[PDB]
CSV table of C-alpha atoms and ligand atoms in Angstrom, one decimal:
chain,number,residue,atom,x,y,z
A,1,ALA,CA,73.7,109.4,70.7
A,2,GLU,CA,73.1,107.4,73.7
A,3,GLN,CA,75.6,108.5,77.3
A,4,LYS,CA,78.8,105.6,77.7
A,5,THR,CA,79.3,105.0,81.1
A,6,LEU,CA,82.6,103.2,82.4
A,7,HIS,CA,82.5,100.7,86.0
A,8,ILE,CA,85.9,100.9,88.5
A,9,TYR,CA,87.0,99.2,91.1
A,10,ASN,CA,89.9,100.5,92.8
A,11,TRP,CA,91.7,100.6,96.3
A,12,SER,CA,90.8,104.3,98.2
A,13,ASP,CA,94.0,106.7,98.0
A,14,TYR,CA,94.9,105.8,94.6
A,15,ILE,CA,93.9,107.7,91.5
A,16,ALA,CA,94.5,111.8,91.7
A,17,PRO,CA,91.5,114.3,92.5
A,18,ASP,CA,90.9,115.3,89.5
A,19,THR,CA,91.4,112.1,87.4
A,20,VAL,CA,88.2,110.8,86.8
A,21,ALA,CA,87.0,114.4,86.2
A,22,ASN,CA,89.6,114.8,83.1
A,23,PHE,CA,89.2,112.1,81.6
A,24,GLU,CA,85.0,112.8,82.1
A,25,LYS,CA,86.5,116.5,80.2
A,26,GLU,CA,87.7,115.0,78.0
A,27,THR,CA,85.8,112.1,76.4
A,28,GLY,CA,82.3,112.5,77.4
A,29,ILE,CA,81.9,108.8,79.3
A,30,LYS,CA,80.2,108.8,82.4
A,31,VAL,CA,82.8,107.4,85.1
A,32,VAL,CA,81.3,105.4,88.1
A,33,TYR,CA,84.3,105.2,90.9
A,34,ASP,CA,84.1,102.9,93.6
A,35,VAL,CA,87.2,102.1,96.4
A,36,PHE,CA,87.7,99.4,98.6
A,37,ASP,CA,89.9,99.7,101.6
A,38,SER,CA,91.4,96.1,101.4
A,39,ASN,CA,91.9,93.9,98.0
A,40,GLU,CA,89.5,90.7,99.8
A,41,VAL,CA,86.4,92.6,99.3
A,42,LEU,CA,87.7,92.4,95.0
A,43,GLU,CA,89.3,89.7,95.7
A,44,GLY,CA,85.8,88.2,96.7
A,45,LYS,CA,83.8,90.0,94.6
A,46,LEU,CA,85.3,88.8,91.2
A,47,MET,CA,85.2,85.0,92.4
A,48,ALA,CA,81.5,84.9,92.6
A,49,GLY,CA,80.9,86.3,89.7
A,50,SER,CA,79.4,89.4,87.8
A,51,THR,CA,80.8,92.1,89.0
A,52,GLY,CA,79.3,95.6,87.3
A,53,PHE,CA,82.7,96.4,87.1
A,54,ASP,CA,84.9,97.2,83.5
A,55,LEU,CA,87.7,97.9,85.5
A,56,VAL,CA,89.3,96.2,88.8
A,57,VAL,CA,93.0,96.4,89.9
A,58,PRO,CA,94.2,93.5,91.4
A,59,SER,CA,97.6,92.7,92.5
A,60,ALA,CA,99.5,91.0,90.0
A,61,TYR,CA,99.8,87.5,92.2
A,62,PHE,CA,95.9,87.7,92.8
A,63,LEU,CA,95.4,88.0,88.7
A,64,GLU,CA,98.1,84.9,88.3
A,65,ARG,CA,95.8,82.3,91.0
A,66,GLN,CA,92.6,83.7,88.4
A,67,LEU,CA,94.1,82.8,85.5
A,68,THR,CA,92.3,79.7,84.5
A,69,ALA,CA,89.8,80.4,86.0
A,70,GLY,CA,88.9,82.9,83.3
A,71,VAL,CA,87.8,86.2,85.9
A,72,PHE,CA,89.3,88.2,83.8
A,73,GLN,CA,90.4,88.7,79.4
A,74,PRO,CA,93.4,89.3,77.1
A,75,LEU,CA,93.9,93.1,76.6
A,76,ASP,CA,93.4,94.3,72.9
A,77,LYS,CA,96.9,96.2,72.7
A,78,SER,CA,95.8,97.7,69.4
A,79,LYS,CA,92.8,99.8,71.4
A,80,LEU,CA,96.2,101.2,73.3
A,81,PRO,CA,99.6,103.0,71.3
A,82,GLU,CA,100.7,103.6,74.1
A,83,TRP,CA,101.5,100.7,75.4
A,84,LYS,CA,105.3,101.3,74.2
A,85,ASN,CA,105.2,103.6,77.7
A,86,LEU,CA,105.1,101.0,80.2
A,87,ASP,CA,108.5,100.5,81.7
A,88,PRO,CA,109.8,97.1,80.2
A,89,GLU,CA,112.1,96.1,83.5
A,90,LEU,CA,108.3,95.9,86.0
A,91,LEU,CA,105.8,94.5,82.8
A,92,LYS,CA,108.6,91.1,83.1
A,93,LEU,CA,107.7,91.4,86.5
A,94,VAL,CA,104.5,91.1,86.4
A,95,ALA,CA,104.6,88.8,83.0
A,96,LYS,CA,106.2,86.3,86.0
A,97,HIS,CA,102.3,85.9,87.0
A,98,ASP,CA,100.9,87.2,83.5
A,99,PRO,CA,102.6,85.8,81.1
A,100,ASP,CA,103.2,87.6,77.3
A,101,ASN,CA,101.4,90.3,80.1
A,102,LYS,CA,97.8,89.4,78.0
A,103,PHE,CA,96.0,90.5,80.8
A,104,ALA,CA,97.0,92.6,82.8
A,105,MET,CA,98.4,96.9,82.9
A,106,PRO,CA,100.7,97.6,85.4
A,107,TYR,CA,99.0,100.7,87.4
A,108,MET,CA,101.5,101.4,90.6
A,109,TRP,CA,104.2,99.3,92.3
A,110,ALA,CA,106.1,99.5,95.8
A,111,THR,CA,107.2,97.5,98.6
A,112,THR,CA,106.6,96.4,102.0
A,113,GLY,CA,108.6,97.5,104.5
A,114,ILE,CA,109.0,100.0,107.5
A,115,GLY,CA,107.4,102.7,107.9
A,116,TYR,CA,107.6,104.8,110.8
A,117,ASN,CA,108.3,108.0,113.1
A,118,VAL,CA,111.7,109.9,113.1
A,119,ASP,CA,111.9,111.6,116.7
A,120,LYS,CA,110.3,108.2,118.4
A,121,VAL,CA,112.4,106.2,116.8
A,122,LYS,CA,115.3,107.7,117.4
A,123,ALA,CA,114.3,109.4,121.4
A,124,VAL,CA,114.1,105.0,122.3
A,125,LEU,CA,116.4,103.8,120.0
A,126,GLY,CA,119.6,106.5,119.9
A,127,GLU,CA,120.0,108.1,117.3
A,128,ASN,CA,122.0,105.2,115.5
A,129,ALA,CA,118.7,103.5,115.7
A,130,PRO,CA,118.9,100.8,112.6
A,131,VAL,CA,116.4,102.6,110.7
A,132,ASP,CA,118.1,100.6,107.4
A,133,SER,CA,117.4,96.9,108.7
A,134,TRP,CA,114.9,94.7,109.2
A,135,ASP,CA,116.6,94.4,112.2
A,136,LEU,CA,114.3,98.0,113.5
A,137,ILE,CA,111.0,95.9,113.5
A,138,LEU,CA,112.5,92.1,113.5
A,139,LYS,CA,114.7,91.8,117.2
A,140,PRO,CA,113.2,92.1,120.0
A,141,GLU,CA,115.5,94.0,122.2
A,142,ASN,CA,114.1,96.6,119.5
A,143,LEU,CA,110.3,96.4,119.4
A,144,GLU,CA,110.4,96.1,123.7
A,145,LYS,CA,112.3,99.1,123.6
A,146,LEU,CA,108.9,100.6,121.0
A,147,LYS,CA,106.4,98.6,122.2
A,148,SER,CA,105.2,101.0,124.6
A,149,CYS,CA,105.6,103.8,122.0
A,150,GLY,CA,103.1,101.4,119.6
A,151,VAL,CA,104.1,98.6,116.6
A,152,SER,CA,101.9,97.6,113.7
A,153,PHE,CA,101.9,94.3,111.8
A,154,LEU,CA,99.9,93.9,108.7
A,155,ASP,CA,97.5,91.3,108.7
A,156,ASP,CA,99.1,89.4,105.5
A,157,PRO,CA,100.0,86.4,106.6
A,158,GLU,CA,101.9,85.5,102.7
A,159,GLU,CA,103.9,89.0,102.8
A,160,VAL,CA,104.9,88.6,106.3
A,161,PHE,CA,105.6,85.0,106.6
A,162,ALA,CA,107.5,85.9,103.0
A,163,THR,CA,109.4,89.2,105.2
A,164,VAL,CA,110.6,87.1,107.7
A,165,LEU,CA,111.5,83.9,106.0
A,166,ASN,CA,113.6,86.6,103.7
A,167,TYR,CA,115.4,87.7,107.0
A,168,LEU,CA,116.1,84.7,108.6
A,169,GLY,CA,118.7,83.5,105.7
A,170,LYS,CA,115.0,81.2,103.8
A,171,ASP,CA,113.8,81.4,99.7
A,172,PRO,CA,111.6,83.9,100.8
A,173,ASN,CA,109.0,81.7,98.3
A,174,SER,CA,109.9,78.5,100.6
A,175,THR,CA,107.8,75.3,100.0
A,176,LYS,CA,108.8,73.4,103.2
A,177,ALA,CA,106.3,74.1,105.7
A,178,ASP,CA,108.4,72.9,108.6
A,179,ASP,CA,110.1,76.9,107.6
A,180,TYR,CA,106.5,78.0,108.4
A,181,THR,CA,105.8,76.2,111.6
A,182,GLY,CA,109.2,76.3,112.7
A,183,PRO,CA,111.9,78.8,112.3
A,184,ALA,CA,108.9,81.5,111.5
A,185,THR,CA,106.5,81.5,113.6
A,186,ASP,CA,109.8,81.2,116.4
A,187,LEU,CA,110.2,85.0,115.8
A,188,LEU,CA,107.0,86.1,115.6
A,189,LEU,CA,105.7,84.3,118.5
A,190,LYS,CA,108.8,86.3,120.0
A,191,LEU,CA,107.8,89.6,118.5
A,192,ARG,CA,104.1,88.9,119.5
A,193,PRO,CA,103.7,90.6,122.8
A,194,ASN,CA,105.6,93.7,121.8
A,195,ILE,CA,102.8,94.5,118.9
A,196,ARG,CA,99.4,96.1,119.6
A,197,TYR,CA,97.7,95.1,116.3
A,198,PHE,CA,97.6,93.5,113.0
A,199,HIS,CA,96.4,95.3,111.0
A,200,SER,CA,96.7,97.3,107.1
A,201,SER,CA,95.5,100.1,107.6
A,202,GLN,CA,95.0,101.1,110.9
A,203,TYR,CA,98.3,102.0,110.8
A,204,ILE,CA,98.4,104.6,108.1
A,205,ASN,CA,96.1,107.5,110.2
A,206,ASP,CA,98.3,105.6,113.5
A,207,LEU,CA,101.3,107.0,112.1
A,208,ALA,CA,100.0,110.1,110.6
A,209,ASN,CA,99.0,110.7,114.1
A,210,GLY,CA,101.7,109.7,116.5
A,211,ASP,CA,99.7,106.8,117.8
A,212,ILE,CA,102.0,104.6,116.3
A,213,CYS,CA,105.8,104.5,116.1
A,214,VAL,CA,107.2,101.7,114.2
A,215,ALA,CA,105.2,99.4,111.5
A,216,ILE,CA,105.5,97.2,108.6
A,217,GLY,CA,103.3,99.6,106.3
A,218,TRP,CA,103.2,99.5,101.9
A,219,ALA,CA,105.7,102.3,101.5
A,220,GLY,CA,103.3,104.9,99.3
A,221,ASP,CA,100.9,104.5,102.4
A,222,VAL,CA,103.5,105.4,104.3
A,223,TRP,CA,104.6,108.0,102.5
A,224,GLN,CA,100.3,109.1,102.2
A,225,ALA,CA,101.2,109.2,105.7
A,226,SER,CA,104.2,111.6,106.0
A,227,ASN,CA,102.5,113.9,104.0
A,228,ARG,CA,99.1,113.6,105.8
A,229,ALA,CA,101.5,114.4,109.1
A,230,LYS,CA,102.8,117.9,107.0
A,231,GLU,CA,100.0,119.0,105.7
A,232,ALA,CA,98.5,118.8,109.6
A,233,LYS,CA,101.1,120.3,110.8
A,234,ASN,CA,101.9,118.8,113.7
A,235,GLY,CA,105.1,118.7,114.1
A,236,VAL,CA,104.9,114.8,113.4
A,237,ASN,CA,108.0,113.4,111.4
A,238,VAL,CA,107.1,110.1,109.8
A,239,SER,CA,109.2,108.1,107.0
A,240,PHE,CA,109.6,104.6,105.5
A,241,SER,CA,112.4,102.2,104.6
A,242,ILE,CA,113.4,99.6,102.2
A,243,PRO,CA,115.6,97.9,104.6
A,244,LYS,CA,119.3,96.2,103.6
A,245,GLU,CA,118.7,93.1,103.7
A,246,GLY,CA,115.8,93.4,101.1
A,247,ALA,CA,112.0,93.4,100.9
A,248,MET,CA,109.3,92.2,99.3
A,249,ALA,CA,107.5,94.1,95.3
A,250,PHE,CA,104.0,94.5,94.4
A,251,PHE,CA,102.8,95.4,91.3
A,252,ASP,CA,98.9,96.4,91.4
A,253,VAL,CA,97.4,95.9,88.0
A,254,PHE,CA,94.6,96.8,86.2
A,255,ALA,CA,91.7,93.9,84.2
A,256,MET,CA,89.5,93.9,82.9
A,257,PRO,CA,86.7,91.8,83.8
A,258,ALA,CA,85.8,89.1,81.3
A,259,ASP,CA,82.2,90.2,81.8
A,260,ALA,CA,82.6,93.2,81.4
A,261,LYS,CA,79.7,95.1,79.0
A,262,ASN,CA,81.9,98.8,78.4
A,263,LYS,CA,84.8,97.9,76.6
A,264,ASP,CA,85.6,100.9,74.4
A,265,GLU,CA,85.2,103.0,77.1
A,266,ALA,CA,88.0,100.7,79.8
A,267,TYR,CA,90.2,101.1,76.7
A,268,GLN,CA,89.9,104.9,76.1
A,269,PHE,CA,90.4,104.6,80.6
A,270,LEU,CA,93.7,102.6,80.2
A,271,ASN,CA,94.9,104.6,77.3
A,272,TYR,CA,94.2,107.9,79.4
A,273,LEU,CA,96.3,106.3,81.8
A,274,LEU,CA,99.4,105.8,79.6
A,275,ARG,CA,99.6,108.8,78.4
A,276,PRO,CA,102.4,110.3,80.4
A,277,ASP,CA,101.3,113.0,82.5
A,278,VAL,CA,98.5,111.5,83.7
A,279,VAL,CA,100.0,108.4,85.9
A,280,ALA,CA,102.6,110.6,87.0
A,281,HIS,CA,100.2,113.7,88.5
A,282,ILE,CA,99.1,110.3,89.9
A,283,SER,CA,102.3,109.6,91.4
A,284,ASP,CA,102.1,113.2,92.3
A,285,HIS,CA,99.2,112.5,94.8
A,286,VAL,CA,99.4,108.8,96.5
A,287,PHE,CA,103.3,108.4,96.7
A,288,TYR,CA,103.0,105.6,94.7
A,289,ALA,CA,105.7,105.1,92.0
A,290,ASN,CA,103.2,104.2,88.4
A,291,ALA,CA,104.5,102.0,85.9
A,292,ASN,CA,105.1,104.0,83.1
A,293,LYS,CA,108.7,105.0,82.0
A,294,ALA,CA,108.0,108.3,80.3
A,295,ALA,CA,106.0,108.9,83.0
A,296,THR,CA,108.5,109.2,85.3
A,297,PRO,CA,110.0,112.5,84.6
A,298,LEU,CA,106.7,114.5,85.0
A,299,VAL,CA,107.2,113.2,88.1
A,300,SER,CA,107.7,115.6,91.1
A,301,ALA,CA,110.7,115.6,92.6
A,302,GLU,CA,110.1,115.2,95.9
A,303,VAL,CA,108.3,111.8,94.4
A,304,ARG,CA,110.6,110.9,91.7
A,305,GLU,CA,113.9,111.0,93.7
A,306,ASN,CA,112.6,109.3,97.3
A,307,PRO,CA,115.0,106.3,97.1
A,308,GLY,CA,111.7,104.4,99.1
A,309,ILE,CA,109.5,104.9,96.4
A,310,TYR,CA,111.4,105.2,93.0
A,311,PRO,CA,114.1,102.6,94.4
A,312,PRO,CA,117.2,102.7,91.9
A,313,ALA,CA,119.3,99.2,90.2
A,314,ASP,CA,120.8,98.7,93.9
A,315,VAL,CA,117.6,97.9,96.3
A,316,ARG,CA,115.6,96.9,93.3
A,317,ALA,CA,118.5,93.3,93.0
A,318,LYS,CA,117.8,93.6,96.6
A,319,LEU,CA,113.7,93.0,96.0
A,320,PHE,CA,112.0,89.5,96.0
A,321,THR,CA,108.2,89.0,94.2
A,322,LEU,CA,105.3,87.0,95.7
A,323,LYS,CA,105.4,82.5,93.4
A,324,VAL,CA,101.8,81.7,94.1
A,325,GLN,CA,102.2,78.5,96.7
A,326,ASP,CA,100.6,74.6,96.5
A,327,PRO,CA,97.3,74.9,98.6
A,328,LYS,CA,98.6,72.5,101.4
A,329,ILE,CA,101.7,75.8,102.1
A,330,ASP,CA,98.3,77.8,101.7
A,331,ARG,CA,96.8,75.6,104.2
A,332,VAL,CA,99.8,76.2,106.8
A,333,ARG,CA,100.5,79.4,106.7
A,334,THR,CA,96.9,80.4,107.7
A,335,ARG,CA,97.0,78.0,110.3
A,336,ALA,CA,100.0,79.3,110.9
A,337,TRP,CA,99.2,82.6,111.1
A,338,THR,CA,96.7,82.2,113.8
A,339,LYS,CA,98.4,80.9,116.8
A,340,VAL,CA,100.9,83.7,116.2
A,341,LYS,CA,97.6,86.6,116.1
A,342,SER,CA,96.3,84.9,118.5
A,343,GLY,CA,99.1,85.5,121.4
B,1,AG2,N1,98.2,95.8,98.7
B,1,AG2,C1,98.4,96.7,97.6
B,1,AG2,N2,97.9,95.1,96.4
B,1,AG2,N3,97.8,97.9,96.8
B,1,AG2,C2,98.0,98.5,98.6
B,1,AG2,C3,97.5,100.3,97.7
B,1,AG2,C4,96.6,100.9,98.6
B,1,AG2,C5,96.5,102.2,97.5
B,1,AG2,N4,96.6,103.4,98.2
B,2,CA,CA1,101.9,91.1,93.3
């Protein structure tokens, strides 16, 4: 008799405009849907406990770090009859963080690559600018030429150091402290005078408006920037590269806090997300690949056929995933990132 409620916490710009409304119309459940613009906000609230959320959207990486902390509770697959729709390849990658896929429902995934302005890069570096390579943004001679049109990096040491280590021919997940303080920091300090800022969201609208011409960014965010520029009929042409040397893949997942009050409603929402049209519609709006293999044909051609959103087998084989480091490396990385950004 009483109203059924559900509290969700997700990234901004990571659902379709009508997803929640459609769910409410179909199920009668009241949804309170809150958003963050950085996962540091989510992670800080989960670690503090008693969030009031029934569903949250962490990284598979963070989820691994909190598996022993009891932040999350295992998902009851009997309430998720469309679980069979999830792509088995992605389930296996997520399971590196969540054995036997016990706690997390893969949601969307993408890569950390290069977002850029096509016209500005070709004006500055020529028609043969190496947009297919990390050389575009990790060679100082190129960044010096791009300095004035604006360069940004993510403010994310784990991802940036891993990208740098892969580029140098080191283990992207090296456990050697000297790899970070030595060769990775050396390259970063060479590049640093040419970097306008380190920020993990300002780069989206700056790419869309023409204010930055190259950025390390998350694929779907860059594709959103490209679409925003198109809708603004502003002439700006943004693209994204998964470079030929490889790149980091990441997997955002739905998970259920251990103190969730509205569990039946949360399962209804997850099984709704597993219906192929629901997550295909989300992908159509947010320009991220969903993790549902049944959904892929339903995604619009512009999105499904974009190999920087849905990469093919050869590109997938070049992606690496982040591993959890020992605390001693975590601290070396954080210390070194502060040095890089300082100067
Ligand atoms: N960095 C992640 N793990 N996800 C980024 C998602 C952003 C959706 N607007
Ligand atoms: Ca991840």
